[PDB]
Amino acid sequence: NLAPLPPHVPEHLVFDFDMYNPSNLSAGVQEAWAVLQESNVPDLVWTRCNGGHWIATRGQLIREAYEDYRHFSSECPFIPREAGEAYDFIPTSMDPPEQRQFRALANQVVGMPVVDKLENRIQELACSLIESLRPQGQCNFTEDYAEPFPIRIFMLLAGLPEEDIPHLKYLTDQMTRPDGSMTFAEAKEALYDYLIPIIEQRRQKPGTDAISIVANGQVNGRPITSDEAKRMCGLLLVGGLDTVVNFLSFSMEFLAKSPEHRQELIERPERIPAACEELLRRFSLVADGRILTSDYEFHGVQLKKGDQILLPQMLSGLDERENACPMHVDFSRQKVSHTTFGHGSHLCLGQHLARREIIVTLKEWLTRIPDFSIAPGAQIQHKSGIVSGVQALPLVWDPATTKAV
Ligand code: HEM
Ligand SMILES: O=C1[C@H]2C[C@@H]3C[C@@H](C[C@H]1C3)C2
């Protein structure tokens, strides 16, 4: 289901890439996308899939377009257009200067200072989860770790019931990796139905949790509106529930297949941080976009007002012009170049938290379970979308090679 090519589009710029179901999926999701960067592919393509939209294929263009909010508006950041349109999250669906007051409040909630306060819990949960798995000699890493670890931390931060996870997680997933089961607007509303009463409650009676702080915040000197708070909290949820979770499964699938990479990290822990960045570059997973505010000519291509463009953050650090031998994982790259957390005014406030969680996982897993692999005859499936993911991750190990801490 291809949409008819609009008049302004040169047919030589056509490359029908399905962000929800790319052709090379079996190879790995990063590998499916990376098709976009082959020699046969122009820098700026038009896809007839998912209603028709441009895609920038190179790090140089992606960065440029991210910097340029004047032309590339966040007002409609998701594809398909109906999704982009229903999209009302704060501060993500706003351009500067309006975005700033909101970002500033989001940052109070998820920023460094919060990470620093949550450290011991992050550590405590990881060690608790891993120690619990260790003696088993096998898990479902996605379900057994990647999901609980980050989500239980977020639930704790937000002051929400762990019981709500399954419902919440389903809804967040419909938004990034739609099933057809629900439209975006519907998923969005259900999430909002959830949030509304909570916000009310926290406006009347303030906690110290993330939601209580957002609900009672000041922005441009006056108090945040209930609708505003609902719109920030909605984003905080998708961020917390759908990001780190997918990231850890890609990284663990790689560690499982690469003993040499595991060893390195065991012997020379001083490299953990560097390895983390390199994993963030290699297993990049987010792709959203922007909307043209007007007619514009970008790198010789005519963009029309209202066109959407996908600016795949995942792609920048996969770009040969940015990284020599991109698909190769090398812990000692002189320069790890990526835009994994985005670029421009919308750079991820949740990045400090995301790194702390990744570094603790790596440190803590490798300590106790140094030797593991993917289960004999399990087939690892990737899933593509706004945020890509791994279906299931069956791991096996010999209990006897583990170390109790
Ligand atoms: C590996 C993990 C993550 C990745 C790769 C990631 C990626 C991104 C990207 C690419 C953007 C900007 C998108 C755009 O410009 O439209 C973004 C923004 C944001 N992310 Fe992260 N995210 C991650 C984890 C988190 C976490 C754990 C949270 C906190 C709950 C979070 C909260 C946010 C927020 C609040 C923004 C909006 C900032 C603004 O609009 O000014 N993210 N993220
Ligand atoms: O609306 C969202 C923004 C862009 C990406 C990452 C995070 C959660 C979802 C998908 C921030």
For 148-167, b/e burial (b = at least 16 CB within 10 A) is: bbbbbbbbbbbebeeeebee
Binding-site residue positions: 348
Q: Going by CA atoms, what residue is nearest to atom 32 of ligand 1? A: 350
In one-letter notation, the amino acid at residue 283 is F
Is residue 325 annotated as a catalytic residue, yes or no?
A: no
Which tokens sit at 396?
């096996």
CA of 158 to the centre of ligand 1 (A): 16
**CA angle (125 as vertex; 253, 174 as ends), nearest 5:** 55
Identity of the amino acid at 371? D
C-alpha closest to that of 196 among 225, 171, 170: 225
Task: Give the nearest ligand 2 atom to 286 CA.
Answer: 5
Sequence-ordered strand ranges (E) for 157-229: 218-219, 222-223
What DSSP state is assigned to residue 348? -
Taking a C-beta distance cutoff of 8 angstroms, is the pair 212, 238 a contact? no
Residue listed under structure tokens 């069956």: 394
Known catalytic membership, residue 243: yes
Which residues, 6+ apart, have CB-to-CB distance to 325 below 8 Å? none
Residue 387, ligand 2, Cβ within 6 A? yes
Nearest atom, ligand 2, residue 78 CA: 1
- Dihedral sign of CA atoms 324, 325, 329, 330 in order: negative
Paired strand residues for 390: 382
In terms of C-beta density within 10 A (0-12 exposed, 13-18 middle, 19 or more buried), how is residue 404 classed? exposed
Domain with 325 in it: what CATH number? Answer: 1.10.630.10
What ligand has the least distance to the C-alpha of 342?
Answer: 1
Catalytic residue list contains 350: yes
Tell me the structure's resolution in angstroms, rounded to a single decimal: 2.1
Q: Of the bound ligands, which one is closest to the alpha carbon of residue 237?
A: 1
Instruction: Centre a 10 Å sphere on the Cβ of residue 16 and count the other Cβ atoms it contains.
Output: 14
At residue 213's C-alpha, the angle toward residues 210 and 217, to 5°, is: 140
Binding site as annotated, residues for heme = 348
182 close to 82: Cβ distance less than 8 angstroms: no
The three-state secondary structure class of 352 is helix
Cα 317 to Cα 340: distance, rounded to the nearest angstrom? 8
Nearest CA to ligand 2 atom 4: 288
CB atoms within 10 A of CB 64: 18
Element (H, E) at 175: helix 165-176
- Out of 350, 362, 385, 389, pick the active-site residue: 350
The number of folded domains in the chain is 1
Q: Name the residue range of residue 220's domain.
A: 1-405
Give the residue, out of 78, 92, 191, with the most ligand 2 atoms within 8 A of its beta carbon, to mutate for a pocket test. 92
List 142, 243, 361, 402, catalytic entry: 243
Nearest CA to ligand 2 atom 11: 239
Q: Contact at 8 Å (CB) between 13 and 301?
A: yes
Exactly one of 137, 271, 348, 371 is catalytic; which is it?
Answer: 348
The verdict on whether 139 is a catalytic residue reads no
Question: Among 296, 243, 271, which Cα is nearest to 359's?
Answer: 271
Q: Measured between alpha carbons, how far is 30 from 388 in angstroms, rounded to an integer?
A: 9
Q: How far apart are CA 341 and CA 358, in angstroms?
A: 14
Instruction: Return all residues near 86 (Cβ < 8 A) that are at least 6 apart.
Output: 183, 184, 185, 188
Give strand pairing partners of 288: 311
383 burial via Cβ count (<10 Å: 0-12, 13-18, 19+): middle
The two three-digit tokens of residue 342, written as one number:
């985005």
Which residues are registered as beta bridge partners of 383? 389
Which of 108, 348, 351 for mutating ligand 1's site (highest number of atoms within 8 Å of CB)? 348
Ligand 1 atom 26: the closest Cα is on which residue? 350
State yes or no: is 172 an active-site residue: no
Is position 242 annotated as part of the catalytic site?
A: yes
Q: What are phi and psi of 206, to 5 degrees?
A: -65, 130
Q: Is 212 helix (H, G, I), strand (E, B) or coil?
A: helix
Beta strands 288-292 and 308-311 are antiparallel
Catalytic position from the list 100, 152, 177, 355: 177
CB 285 within 8 A of CB 307: no
Q: What is the dihedral of CA 391, 175, 296, 343, to 10 degrees?
A: -70
- The secondary structure of 44-58 as a DSSP string is EEEE-GGG-EEEE-S
- Rounded-to-integer distance, Cα 55 and Cα 212, Å: 39
DSSP reduced 3-state for 165 = helix
Task: Take residue 11 and report the two structure tokens written for it.
Answer: 């047919």
CB 315 within 8 A of CB 19: no
